[PDB]
Amino acid sequence: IHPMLHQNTSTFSEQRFSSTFTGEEFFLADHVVKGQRVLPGVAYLEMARSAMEHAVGEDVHGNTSMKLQNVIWARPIVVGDQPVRVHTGLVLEEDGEVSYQIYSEAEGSDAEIVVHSQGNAVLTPRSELHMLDLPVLQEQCSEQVISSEEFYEFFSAIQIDYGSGHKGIDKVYVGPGQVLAKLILPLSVTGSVDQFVLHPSLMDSALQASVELTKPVMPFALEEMEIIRPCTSEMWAYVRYSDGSQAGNKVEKYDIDLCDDIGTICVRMKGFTSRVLE
Amino acid sequence: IHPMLHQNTSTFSEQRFSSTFTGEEFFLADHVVKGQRVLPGVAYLEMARSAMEHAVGEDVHGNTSMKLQNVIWARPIVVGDQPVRVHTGLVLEEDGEVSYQIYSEAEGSDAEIVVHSQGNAVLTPRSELHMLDLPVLQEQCSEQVISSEEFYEFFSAIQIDYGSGHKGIDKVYVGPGQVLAKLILPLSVTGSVDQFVLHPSLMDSALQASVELTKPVMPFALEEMEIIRPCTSEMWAYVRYSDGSQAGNKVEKYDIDLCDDIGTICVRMKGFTSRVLE
Ligand SMILES: [Mg+2]
């Protein structure tokens, strides 16, 4: 169905989308964490996204702008020479919201369910197509500059080995409480672009920039995510603090924005919390 | 998923199983009706069956014996050099029953739904494994005997051309208000046997015997169907009148039973009405 959403395993008890990740996938071969083979927090969002679209059928006109609220991450998925089957389960609220979970079932005990990520999803009309000032942004973000290699080499010191596919970051501009970052899709994943709406390669890269506040940092809680246009054309990301004043080495809360060449915002994050891996 | 149930296209509005039949299928290449390429009334039952099993998930022990009640047929599916997509839609009743429909959407107007078969499905504990008297049955069914060729040649006069795959009938014994029939799976479909539970080749053949009361006869209304063991081992069918005394050239109501070599009843029909094609 979708590179992270393989088939529909829905019964009368649940709306379900099951997926099996051997390890051959690019997002699972170019994002190494603590030595183990781990799926990125951003991938959980595109499953919840592509679940939702398919959990809704033929409909006349209407609004399409999907808003993912109060997303959380509990336990990363580790892939060790054993195919893992992951289940994305949806529940429609009487009010109209949709809550979701992304769990799996262990190969040792199938009667046990483990939750890797939760949240809510609601469909929403489009607001104004907010456009960021691409020339003005670099002006304030002229204090420090980091190149791709140095950026990625900095992670390898923390032992977070981003392979070819996740090398989407490019130039990185720092300002005061401002972050900017040009990012481009990698050549390896040239073809595979029209299969995704929230392409992991660029998105995770956008999340990678948020760590430039400075142990492996892991997505913890995102309180809002707004999708407008497909995350393909967009090669610019912009990270700033959220108006919470909550800064520290264990909990940090940001507002990230990705945008087209022109600067048309296509994805918009708010309240994104990152937490250290133990 | 299943040779007549291809994938699961379920949304929050409906439990769905969509299937596309090009015409290459055996049950759609060996059952010609009025010159047009038509799907057999029996195939609608195995979709409703295999829908149901998959519309129910992981469960601890429990009863498995699926009972299809008040099945009806409205409009045959005609396949004319154009792939047709057929949708099997399920609805769970508060009481516990499950009603179903098997519709499609036309290639000229997609906003229109056409219903080919309806009914109810309920899950039920197994009753006693009723066994028929195979030696005693031929005793009373010794009045008239028809061979395979003559049987099938009789249909071709009505222009119902059963090809290799639907040539499952063998010996046919007639008694007074009794019908018997040995039937065997065809060599063409030797491999494809473990893919079905209600194998069309034998089942339709069992329905073919019911017409031996004597225009193309078409299944109209079956008020009960009970499945116990997979319709693979079973090579014997037995057709008798239902205790309704409702006999005639337009409406006829029977009780068919299929059974193993030994005689273990695996499928059991009751109240099966057949009606003439206009
Ligand atoms: Mg439902």
Side-chain angles (χ1 to χ4, degrees), chain A residues 7-8 10-12 15 54-55, chain B residues 7-8 10-12 15 54-55:
Chain A
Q7 284 308 336
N8 186 17
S10 293
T11 55
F12 295 123
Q15 185 75 49
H54 288 95
Chain B
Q7 284 308 336
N8 186 17
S10 293
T11 55
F12 295 123
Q15 185 75 49
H54 288 95

Side-chain angles (χ1 to χ4, degrees), chain B residues 167-179:
Chain B
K167 304 280 256 194
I169 298 289
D170 186 11
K171 307 188 182 186
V172 177
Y173 296 93
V174 176
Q178 298 170 338
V179 176

Side-chain angles (χ1 to χ4, degrees), chain B:
Chain B
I1 294 169
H2 176 272
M4 309 179 210
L5 186 151
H6 292 142
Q7 284 308 336
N8 186 17
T9 69
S10 293
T11 55
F12 295 123
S13 60
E14 193 180 12
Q15 185 75 49
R16 233 194 287 120
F17 293 89
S18 300
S19 294
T20 315
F21 305 119
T22 58
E24 309 201 5
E25 297 87 0
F26 51 117
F27 43 88
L28 278 167
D30 288 336
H31 173 269
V32 181
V33 169
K34 205 188 195 180
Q36 280 171 320
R37 183 63 236 165
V38 172
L39 186 75
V42 66
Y44 297 89
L45 300 175
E46 181 57 6
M47 293 191 283
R49 193 209 75 82
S50 52
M52 184 79 180
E53 172 63 352
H54 288 95
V56 180
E58 90 270 355
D59 275 344
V60 55
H61 293 98
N63 66 345
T64 64
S65 184
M66 194 176 292
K67 190 172 183 286
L68 296 177
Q69 293 177 335
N70 293 8
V71 184
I72 63 173
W73 289 268
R75 292 171 195 82
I77 299 163
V78 179
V79 182
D81 73 26
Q82 295 156 343
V84 64
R85 187 167 188 74
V86 180
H87 304 288
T88 305
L90 275 66
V91 173
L92 171 56
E93 306 308 326
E94 275 71 7
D95 65 9
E97 248 187 355
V98 171
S99 60
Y100 69 85
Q101 305 185 32
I102 299 164
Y103 44 126
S104 181
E105 288 167 342
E107 62 180 347
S109 290
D110 290 336
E112 172 64 13
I113 69 176
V114 183
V115 186
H116 301 291
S117 186
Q118 284 178 347
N120 297 122
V122 74
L123 296 176
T124 294
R126 294 184 182 176
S127 182
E128 293 177 350
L129 295 174
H130 192 71
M131 291 177 68
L132 296 175
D133 275 338
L134 289 171
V136 173
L137 283 162
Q138 306 177 18
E139 292 173 352
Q140 296 174 328
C141 296
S142 57
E143 180 178 5
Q144 198 183 19
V145 176
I146 293 169
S147 176
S148 172
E149 57 162 321
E150 293 178 337
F151 171 87
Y152 290 99
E153 289 182 351
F154 176 79
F155 283 123
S156 296
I158 311 156
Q159 271 288 300
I160 307 165
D161 286 336
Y162 291 101
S164 178
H166 278 273
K167 304 280 256 194
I169 298 289
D170 186 11
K171 307 188 182 186
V172 177
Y173 296 93
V174 176
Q178 298 170 338
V179 176
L180 179 64
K182 194 168 182 173
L183 57 84
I184 295 98
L185 60 87
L187 294 174
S188 55
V189 298
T190 295
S192 189
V193 56
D194 67 22
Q195 286 175 325
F196 304 94
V197 178
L198 293 171
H199 202 285
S201 300
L202 294 84
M203 283 275 280
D204 186 64
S205 296
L207 266 58
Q208 295 166 359
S210 70
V211 174
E212 195 165 352
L213 62 88
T214 304
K215 273 75 185 181
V217 170
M218 292 287 108
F220 180 77
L222 169 77
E223 76 193 352
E224 205 186 20
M225 192 167 71
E226 185 177 1
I227 295 102
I228 296 172
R229 290 178 175 254
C231 173
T232 57
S233 56
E234 62 187 343
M235 307 289 173
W236 289 101
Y238 170 61
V239 184
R240 62 189 176 279
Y241 282 56
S242 61
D243 59 352
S245 62
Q246 40 194 312
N249 56 45
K250 286 203 176 266
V251 58
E252 278 288 329
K253 189 176 142 186
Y254 292 102
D255 298 349
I256 306 163
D257 292 353
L258 281 60
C259 51
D260 194 358
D261 297 347
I262 305 155
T264 311
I265 301 298
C266 303
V267 186
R268 177 176 184 171
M269 288 182 164
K270 181 177 179 179
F272 175 74
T273 291
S274 291
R275 195 165 287 231
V276 162
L277 184 139
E278 281 91 1

